[PDB]
């Protein structure tokens, strides 16, 4: 629930000097009558900050949060309320929300869906977010609060820490020196890259009083701090020919899968990463993006032809006839399987009987094992000596190929790449 505003006036931003602003305690330690140097994100002297004025005038822009921000605001009658910190300001990311109503101060981080124009409006209207469903961190804190009031705020996000700095003192930006003690340390541990402010509008309707605030940037610079006896701060100063195995006219049998070993080269996966015809890139264990970074000491290649059903069934979580009696994947597999359609070839006028596969086996098959299916199979009590009987026969079967099958009922050219870990030095690392 948000209300769009179309009365905004566009003016160029103004700039204000930053002579003696942007100084705080480097740490919780206390030092007196000694000069100490620290390396931390401060605000260098004679820097440039941007002048924002509120008076209708409702300048509420959005600026990126590259580094720490120094917030200086001359304040009267409680105009500003808080700030929004977030990356994209939607439900897809986690964003902060700081509001200080008439009772207390609550700090809540959720998946707030900020509208185009979030603001606040006695105060009984809070149009900041729609809803949230999955968020846990919620915090409640003590209330932190002619113009006569000035506030300084410095926000830093280092090592997943959100430190807020507050200082209240009476009074264009005045020239002077003041301390800035830490108040609350909160370990939010979230990514922040953009920020925006909040403006409160008072109905009569939606009127904003004379208020101004400054936004500054922080840079790493060494500073010198001088103390005294009272304990206060006074002043500051050889490639593998993969085309042979990826463009061969003929492959081996399904049950008699060819065994090949090619090494002593570099792994140029970008050559086949951009290929057009293949559409399957299933991988387990190692991500494809990292695959061009780490070093593998073993490279194995397999050459066989089979339809996409076995390509989907190659996962160890499911079984099958081929997946149990012909070829199965080990449980600790870390490789990948690549398959592509080859309907343009391997389809003659008649059927092709050059590819055969096993059907029956007594028990399971150990992975990466060579087995020859040439003996007779027996099922009854009386075995046969090669006789094609009722219970005794040959498990092997032929194939039938036609150009009028279904969407996925076509043979695919399947190549299997497996990666193994061993103490032996790697022969292929590039």
């Amino acid at each position, epitope marked *: 629930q948000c209300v769009n505003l179309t009365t905004r006036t566009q003016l160029p931003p103004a700039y204000t000097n930053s002579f003696t602003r942007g100084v705080y305690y480097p740490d919780k330690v206390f030092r007196s009558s000694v000069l100490h140097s620290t390396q931390d994100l401060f605000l260098p002297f004679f820097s440039n900050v941007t002048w924002f004025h509120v008076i209708k005038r409702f300048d509420n822009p959005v600026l990126p949060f590259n580094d720490g921000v120094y917030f200086a605001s001359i304040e009267k009658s409680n105009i500003i309320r808080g700030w929004i910190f977030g990356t994209t300001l939607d439900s897809k990311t986690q964003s902060l929300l700081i509001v200080n109503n008439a009772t207390n101060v609550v700090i809540k981080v959720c998946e707030f869906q900020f509208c185009n124009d979030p603001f606040l409006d006695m105060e009984s209207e809070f149009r900041v977010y729609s809803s949230a469903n999955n968020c846990t961190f919620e915090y409640v804190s003590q209330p932190f609060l002619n113009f006569k009031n000035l506030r300084e705020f410095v926000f830093k996000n280092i090592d997943g820490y959100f430190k807020i700095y507050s200082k209240h003192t009476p009074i264009d930006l005045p020239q002077g020196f003041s301390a800035l003690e830490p108040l609350v340390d909160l370990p939010i541990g979230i990514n922040i890259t953009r920020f925006q402010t909040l403006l409160a509008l008072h109905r009569s309707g939606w009127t904003a009083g004379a208020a101004a605030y400054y936004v500054g940037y922080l840079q790493p610079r060494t500073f010198l701090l001088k103390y005294n006896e009272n304990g206060t701060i006074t002043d500051a100063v050889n490639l593998c020919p993969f085309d042979e195995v990826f463009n061969a006219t003929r492959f081996a049998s399904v049950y008699a899968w060819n065994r090949k070993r090619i090494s002593n080269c570099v792994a140029d996966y970008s050559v086949l990463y951009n290929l057009a015809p293949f559409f399957t890139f299933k991988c387990y264990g190692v991500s494809p993006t990292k695959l061009n970074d780490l070093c593998f000491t073993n490279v194995y290649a397999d050459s066989f032809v089979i339809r996409g059903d076995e390509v989907r069934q190659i996962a160890p979580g499911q079984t099958g006839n081929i997946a149990d009696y012909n070829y199965k994947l080990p449980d600790d597999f870390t490789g990948c399987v690549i398959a592509w359609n080859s309907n343009k070839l391997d389809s003659k006028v008649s059927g092709n009987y050059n590819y055969l596969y096993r059907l029956f086996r007594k028990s399971n098959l150990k992975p990466f094992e060579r087995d020859i299916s040439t003996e007779i199979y027996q099922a*009854g009590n009386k075995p046969c000596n090669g006789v094609a009987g009722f219970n005794c026969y040959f498990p092997l*079967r032929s194939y039938s*190929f036609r150009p009028t099958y279904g969407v996925g009922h076509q043979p695919y050219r399947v190549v299997v790449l497996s990666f193994e870990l061993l103490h032996a030095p790697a022969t292929v690392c590039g």
Partner: antibody
Amino acid sequence: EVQLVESGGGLIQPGGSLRLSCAASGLTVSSNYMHWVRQAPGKGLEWVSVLYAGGSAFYADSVKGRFTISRNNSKNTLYLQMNSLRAEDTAIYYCARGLGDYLDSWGQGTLVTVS
Amino acid sequence: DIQMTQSPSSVSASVGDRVTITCRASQGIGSWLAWYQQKPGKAPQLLIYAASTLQSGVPPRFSGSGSGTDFTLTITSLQPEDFASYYCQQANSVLALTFGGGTKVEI
């Protein structure tokens, strides 16, 4: 020269446990696939359950759960067990054996009714 | 994903006639079709397998011809003994056989 026998029919309440027996004659169930098929009155055959020659069983989408098959090689008898049944699940059941892509062996059946 | 259907449902013909019973498949199955008989109150029997060959013991009456989609069973003479139903069996890579409706032949 091949025959099959079945036992286990009777009166079973809906959502109950029933055990079926299928003793192969002349064939060993540990070396060949087991097949189950139903013939409803006024309807046709469709998938029921098929046990592999190893220690694995295949089920369809509707019968993925609630089914547990543990064959015994001591007496060469196929065992079928389910824990829940509906009002539309009663028909004649046949245990069967066959080769790849077609089934040959058949037999009689046991009838069970629910109410 | 896959379903079998049969356009004929009940065809009556004499002994010297052709039933012309076929099974319709959405996608193409290559020579993996078998036809069975369902006798009311009796055990089923084998007729053919793979739609090209003949099972041993089956009398030479039931035949078939079709590459991927158009399969038609041909009977030279309709004997009075084999008056049962017809079912078409097709399977994918795994042994997931699919069956359609039944066609009844009456005198």
